[PDB]
Amino acid sequence: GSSGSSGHKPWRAEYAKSSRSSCKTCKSVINKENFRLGKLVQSTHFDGIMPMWNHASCILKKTKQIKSVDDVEGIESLRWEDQQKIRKYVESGAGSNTSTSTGTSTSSSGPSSG
């Protein structure tokens, strides 16, 4: 795919228009009409960006994920309650019950089929 829009937000916000995608944090299906989050990670090799699809609640529960609501794209399209989950997460100490962990464990990361 071709494009030309300098600058790209790390996180994305938009209601899933399908139920084919499956979260990575919980490894479940993301039914359409739901608020999810996609962690865009640029690569050095030649390959279409891989948006890490994860329930908006699967990420917010984690720590050191989002810096500010400004980093989230399309966040203005999300429902009020949803938009709050972001700002109310980036402003306040990410995570609850002081539950902080270094990223996520490794799961056969490599030969992943698909």
- Extract the annotated binding site for Zn(2+): 23, 26, 55, 58
Give the x-and-dash track for 87-106 against Zn ion (CB under 5 A). --------------------
Contact between 29 and Zn ion (CB under 5 A)? no
Q: Which of 64, 58, 61, 69 shows the shortest CA–CA distance to 24?
A: 58
Provide the CB-side half-sphere exposure for 18 (13 A, CA).
4
DSSP run (H or E) holding 82: helix 80-90
CA distance 42 to 27: 22
Tell me the residue nearest to Zn ion as measured from the CB.
23
Give the x-and-dash track for 34-63 against Zn ion (CB under 5 A). ---------------------x--x-----
Site residue total, Zn ion (CB under 5 A):
5
Contact between 23 and Zn ion (CB under 5 A)? yes
CA distance 113 to 94: 32
| Binding interface with Zn ion (CB under 5 A) | 23, 25-26, 55, 58
